[PDB]
Structure formats: C-alpha cells, structure tokens
Copies of this chain bind each other. A is one copy, B any other.
Amino acid sequence: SLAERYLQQIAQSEALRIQQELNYARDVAHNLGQGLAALPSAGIKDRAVVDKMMEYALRDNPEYLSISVIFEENVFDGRDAEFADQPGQAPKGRYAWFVDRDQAGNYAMHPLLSYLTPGQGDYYLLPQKSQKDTLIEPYTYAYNGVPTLLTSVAAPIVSQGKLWGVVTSDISLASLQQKINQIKPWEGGGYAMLLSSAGKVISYPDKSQTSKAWQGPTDNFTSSVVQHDDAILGEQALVTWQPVTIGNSTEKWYLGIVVPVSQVMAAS
C-alpha cells in the first residue's frame, strides 16, 4: 500500500537522522583511537599526552558526559606494572582513564575502576572481545555525585591487525531523548520511540519507562506496519520499526514511529 510505504519511508528518514548522531559519537571515539595508536609508533610514550588528546575531544563535544580510553595491557608504554598498585590508578596499572567536566567546567581525569568487571565494565569488555563497534546497553554512572543514565558508543582501536584497546563516547540518555521527543512523524503529531538491542527503552514519551524492558507491540521489531491501541495517543495507531546501526556493528537499535490511524487513513 502507498500509505504504508510512505510511513515506512518516514521511519527510514528518522532512523537515518538518529543514526547520524550516534555515528558521529562513534567517529569521535574511533578517530581519537587511531591517533592514540599512532603515538607509540612516533615514539611518544607519555600518558599525559593521551590525557590531553582526550581532553580536546571532550572539549569539542560539550554535550557528551565523558570520553573513556582503555589501552590493552602494556601496549602503550609497557609500564603498567609501575602504576599497578599506586594510589588513584586503574586496576593493574592499565591506561584505563576517562575525562569529564567538574562543577566549574574544568576537565578532570579519573581512573576506570570498573573496566575489568562484568556488567559495569561492558563498555570495555564487550567490544574488546568482539572487536566490533558497539552501542552499549543503558547503565548508570555518578558524575560529580549525580547518578546519570547513559549509554556508551564504544569503538575498538584496530590497526594493522593489532588491537590497541577501546575508546568510548559517553552519552546521556536524556540528551538522546531530547532529540527523539522532537520527532513529530505525521503532520505535527504522532511520536517516535527508541529501543536498545536487548529491547531496553532508550526514549519513550513516558520517561518513567527509561532503561526498562519494553513489554509492548513489536513482532521482532518488524518493518511491516501494524495497528495497535496506543496509550500515548489514546487511539488506534500505526507502528513501524527501522534499525539503527553504527560503524561496523552487527547488532542494532530500533527506532519506532507511531502515528494515529485517524490522520493517516483519513488523509488517504
């Protein structure tokens, strides 16, 4: 049907827009990583140089929560054992650090205490093993004493067959929701929703649903158009899903478009 193809095409356009936002974040992390891997080749072995490069990347991205960098064991300078148990360092002396902004807006380095533990540390552990770009399931981190729901857009660092580590761009769920809730897919109405790979809510007009498992209408996040009793719109709605993918990832997120049957069938 012509209406349903048009609806499918709207969903495609909107998934491409949000895909551009997430790829931008992947690119910041991926391109920062390629430059960091060039440093040992050029004879630069000073971890303060990595700190400054990470700082300038965060500086250029004022809405990001932080940038995180994890090199593989010893590959940067060979000195993980010297840092191993010193105060304020990361587990086993690894170059595993992130940069964020303080309450005054100046830039601070903090060690990645979580990077070896399953769950919290998946921003490192999952892409380290797959060597694939990865949109990480939503989780929580306290920045300046404020619990914050976020995702990480993680990019393995691969060059000349060698894994150098992982770089991530750390993105608040709120900032994503700010873009998704602007989407008005049909004559200034309807709404858009965004779901993770595991089907966790990234953005839904009922913010109380954030980070929770979706328990609703999808038939395996189909591209087909399906009619549902929608609680946000309070009427019969048409729903279609489109995938969102970054870099070389094989997994995906799902953008959903929801429009009222009344305004669609009636426009005909």
Question: For the side of the interface on A, what is the size category?
Answer: 35 or more
Given known pairs A10-B9, A267-B2, the reply for A42 and B31 (CB within 8 Å) is: no
Most B Cβ at <10 Å: residue of A20, A23, A46, A52 = A52
Check if B160 sits within 8 Å of A59, measured CB to CB.
Answer: yes
Considering only residues 231-268 of chain A, those with a C-beta below 8 Å from chain B are 267-268
Chain A window 49-76, contacts with chain B (Cβ cutoff 8 Å), 1 for yes, 0 for no? 1011101110110000000000000000
B35, A42: Cβ atoms closer than 8 Å? no
Query: Closest residue to A49 on the B side, CB-wise?
Result: B42
A39 on the interface (CB 8 Å rule)? yes
Whether A53 pairs with B42 at a CB distance below 8 angstroms is yes
* B56/A38 in contact, CB under 8 A: yes
A51 to B42, CA, bound (A): 9
Residue of B nearest to A50 (CB): B42
Q: Which of B44, B52, B55 contacts A49 (CB 8 A)?
A: B44
Least distance between A230 CB and chain B CB atoms (Å) = 22
Which residues of B sit under 8 angstroms from A139, Cβ to Cβ? none
Contacts of A46 in B (CB 8 A): 42
CB distance from A93 to the nearest CB of B (A): 21
* A41 and chain B: residue at smallest CB distance: B52
- A 144-186 to B, binary, CB cutoff 8 A, 1 in contact else 0: 0000000000000001100000000000000000000000000
B residues less than 8 Å from A12 (CB atoms): 9, 13
Task: Say yes or no for A110: interface residue by CB 8 A criterion.
Answer: no
A28 to B23, CA, bound (A): 12
Which residues of chain B come closer than 8 Å to A267, judged between CB atoms?
Answer: 2
A109 on the B face (CB < 8 A): no
Render A1-19 as a binary contact track against B, CB cut-off 8 A, 1 for contact: 0110110011011001101
Lowest 10 A-B CB distances belong to which pairs? A31-B31, A16-B16, A27-B27, A42-B52, A38-B56, A35-B35, A9-B9, A6-B6, A42-B49, A38-B53
**A residues lining the B interface (CB < 8 Å):** 2-3, 5-6, 9-10, 12-13, 16-17, 19-20, 23-24, 27-28, 31-32, 34-35, 37-39, 41-44, 46, 48-49, 51-53, 55-57, 59-60, 159-160, 267-268
